[PDB]
Design a protein around this ligand. Structure first.
Ligand SMILES: CC(=O)NCCCNCc1ccc(-c2ccccc2)c(Cl)c1
Ligand SMILES: CC(=O)NCCCNCc1ccc(-c2ccccc2)c(Cl)c1
Ligand SMILES: Cc1ccc(O)c(C(=O)O)c1
Length: 327
């Protein structure tokens, strides 16, 4: 007949009960600030259709971040702007401070609050079991917030989590892939970065929800506690699912596709194979045992599940025993 419909177990109808003003980002009126208020200092990085710069707001001598967008698609820019304005002030959500335009090049730029990112490659060795529990909890505060506001981030990964370790400040950045959750809507599966992509995306199941973010979060936690970057190392989108199946096993994959009447792409036939369900304890080694505990393993087991409906919600995750040591 076709695939079985699905819906989020929490915050299902938050957008349904809100005016069109909230979620109709295409109708949203954007108002430009003064580009001249900002002096570009240095290039921070380069994205798909963006160039990120450290800058100074010369009207208050304050450091800011300017993300210049290659205006490839207007609807996309408007969606990012609306979502950022809706979530502004939310816990651990990057604060959009201004929106500016370069008249000569005819290029939009989003201006954010500055975050001093502490070096990731130097964090990895010194970091403790407590530090992982603490920053995991800070990310879930950002997720429970944006999901309660009817938004899925759809690009949760270490590059999109900024940390100022000195001040124990975390921010969830780059809301360029984020979308308003409407029950029953069929979304584009070309979202998230390969390693972080949930099985729903890999099997082309379009009626996904907030729970997509909880899978990406589980990939990050597995990678941190096991010191294995990335945890699921696919070489392409079909291989990515094969890497998951090498961990979760192929039996539960068939239970997932059957439950939702998903048509597996024929490209999966020769590469899928047969895989047994692995124990999480098998990934424990001398290099990572100080970060691993039974609470961490029970928590991870509750996030990394094929069935999107069966994953912990951000709020259920915050109530898990893994976070009993955090405030
Ligand atoms: C003084 N003014 C400096 C200056 C010029 C141009 C831009 C700009 C704005 C949008 C897109 C690309 C560049 C900025 Cl942020 C600052
Ligand atoms: C734009 C830009 O400069 N990005 C830099 C990305 C910086 N990433 C560093 C980092 C460090 C720790 C974690 C983490 C993960 C799981 C639990 C606890 C902490 C994550 Cl997700 C990311
Ligand atoms: C602070 C900061 C740095 C880089 C970025 O790309 C963003 C963002 O996308 O929101 C934010």
């Amino acid at each position: 007949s076709g695939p079985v419909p699905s819906r989020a177990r929490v915050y299902t109808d938050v957008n349904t009960h809100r005016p069109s003003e909230y979620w109709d980002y295409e109708s949203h009126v954007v108002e430009w600030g003064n580009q001249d208020d900002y002096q570009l200092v240095r290039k921070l990085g380069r994205g798909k259709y963006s160039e990120v710069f450290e800058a100074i707001n010369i009207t208050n001598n304050e450091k800011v971040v300017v993300k210049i967008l290659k205006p490839v698609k207007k609807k996309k820019i408007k969606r990012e702007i609306k979502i950022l304005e809706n979530l502004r002030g939310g816990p651990n959500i990057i604060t959009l401070a201004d929106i500016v335009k370069d008249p000569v090049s005819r290029t939009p730029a989003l201006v954010f609050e500055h975050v001093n990112n502490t070096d990731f490659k130097q964090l990895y060795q010194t970091l403790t079991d407590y530090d992982i529990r603490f920053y995991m909890y800070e990310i879930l505060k950002a997720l429970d917030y944006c999901h309660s506001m009817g938004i899925m981030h759809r690009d949760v990964k270490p590059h999109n989590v900024m940390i100022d370790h000195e001040h124990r400040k975390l921010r969830l950045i780059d809301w360029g892939l984020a979308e308003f959750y409407h029950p029953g809507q069929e979304y584009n599966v070309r979202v998230a970065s390969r390693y972080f992509k949930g099985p729903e995306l890999l099997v082309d199941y379009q009626m996904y929800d907030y729970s997509l973010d909880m899978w990406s979060l589980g990939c990050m936690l597995a990678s941190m506690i096991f010191r294995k970057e990335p945890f699921f190392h696919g070489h392409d989108n079909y291989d990515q699912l094969v890497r998951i199946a090498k961990v979760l096993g192929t039996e539960d994959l068939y239970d997932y596709i059957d439950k939702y009447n998903i048509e597996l792409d024929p490209r999966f036939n020769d590469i899928l194979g047969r895989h047994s369900r692995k124990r999480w304890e098998r990934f424990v080694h001398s290099e990572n045992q100080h970060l691993v505990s039974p609470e961490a393993l029970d928590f991870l087991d509750k996030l990394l599940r094929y069935d999107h409906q069966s994953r912990l919600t951000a709020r259920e995750a915050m109530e898990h025993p893994y976070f009993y040591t955090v405030v």
